[PDB]
């Protein structure tokens, strides 16, 4: 499942 606090930026 998605962690909303994880890196939201491109990579």
């Amino acid at each position, epitope marked *: 499942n*998605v962690d909303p606090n994880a890196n*939201p930026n491109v990579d």
Partner: antibody
Amino acid sequence: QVQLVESGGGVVQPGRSLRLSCAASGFTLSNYGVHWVRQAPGTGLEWVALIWYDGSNKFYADSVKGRFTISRDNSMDIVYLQMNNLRAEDTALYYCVRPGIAAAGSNYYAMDVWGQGTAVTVSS
Amino acid sequence: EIVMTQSPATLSMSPGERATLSCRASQSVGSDLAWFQQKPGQAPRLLIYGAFTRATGIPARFSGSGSGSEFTLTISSLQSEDFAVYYCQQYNRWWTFGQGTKVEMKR
């Protein structure tokens, strides 16, 4: 150097809608997720919403869920906060914010770039 | 939500002194803790992230420490430019802020 630039604030009647926008200067905004953080006159900071770099994941504070909608146009490189059914308690300065830097060994990113803020005044 | 509690509400300081600001979390946030400075009419400015890492451009007299739910911002040899409101923020579980400590001039 690097800045975030917002626009769209103003006086709006209770229950009406208002759309904020955010752009980057000195970097490409679409490389980053984008937050909105608001500050009401005389009080502290309140996180509002977040949109993933590619516009997939969107997240909202409980206080605005179902009323606010976040979106982005990665062609123009602009992030939008669509605010509907506004109330007096949404009166605040709204900051566009970049989560641009992470501590060593972390994949969690702190809010390193803040816009100047656009003022939203909900009033009749 | 995770509640961030700062103390004292106001810290009265003279230039040249050491300021010690406290930030408590209602549960562990690991090291995902940031400190911000804010002056009237201006946006917050990131000082510290990862609990102890100083952001680029910030003078070395600012340092963060702590872990879990207990954090401290130390301003050594305070300068007149440092009178401001300081916020802590956890970014471990959503995003929540303390209510700020005002550092004012003592007299």
